[PDB]
Structures are given as structure tokens and as C-alpha cells.
Amino acid sequence: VNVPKTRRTFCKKCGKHQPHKVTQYKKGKDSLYAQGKRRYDRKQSGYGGQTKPIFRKKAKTTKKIVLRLECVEPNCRSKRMLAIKRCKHFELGGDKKRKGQVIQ
């Protein structure tokens, strides 16, 4: 799809519509001291082999691309996630489609 890098939408803290800054969400690096990852290693260590499932039956090919909305007004600077439907190709303000233009 195509989403612009600017978006005049609602800011929760401000309590109004203010112009936001759109950027694609990525994951963070997995903390080694998250309780789950700590529990995992205590269980995984020693003998017993692999203790929890390894998912292999990978079915779907694309993600629900998420936008990281960021308030521009510099007192607030509050953010939230904005999940959009599944799409394969994705760009932020690439090239606006035009009309009456020749496909050469």
C-alpha cells in the first residue's frame, strides 16, 4: 500500500487532533532478563533437550504492517500503534498516483 509520513489525527494526551509523524513499526531486541526468557533458559538448560514447542507450520507470507504515530507538538511527543490490514508491498509517501498521465 502507501501511507503518508504526516497524519492530522487524534493525540490521547493532548485530547485533540494534532499533526502526527508516521513511521513503520519494527520489533525491539528480545530482553535476556524478560521473565519468560529467564524461565525458558532455567527450563531449557541441563538434559531433557528442547522443552517447549518450535513452530514450523508457517502459513502466511505477509504481516499486519503497523504505523508508529508520533505527536509533533514538543510538550506532548506521545505515541501509539495504528495497525492496518495485511499487504505485501508497502512504502511511506512514495509517489502520489496521478490521472490523465500516459502509461509508457
Q: Which of 10, 24, 41, 43 binds RNA (CB under 7 A)?
A: 10
Type and span of the H or E element at 79:
strand 79-83
b/e code 60-97 from CB counts within 10 Å (16+ = b): eeeeebebebbbeeeebeebeebeeeeeeeeeeeeeee
Q: Which of the 8 DSSP states describes residue 21?
A: E
Q: How many residues does the chain have?
A: 104
Binding to RNA, residues 17-76 (CB under 7 A): 17, 25, 27-37, 39-40, 49-64, 66, 68
| Binding of RNA by 2 (CB under 7 A) | yes
**76 among annotated binding-site residues:** yes
Q: Site residues (CB under 7 A) for RNA? A: 1-4, 7-10, 12-13, 15-17, 25, 27-37, 39-40, 49-64, 66, 68, 78-89, 93-97, 99-100, 104
Task: Show binding-site residues for Zn(2+).
Answer: 11, 14, 71, 76
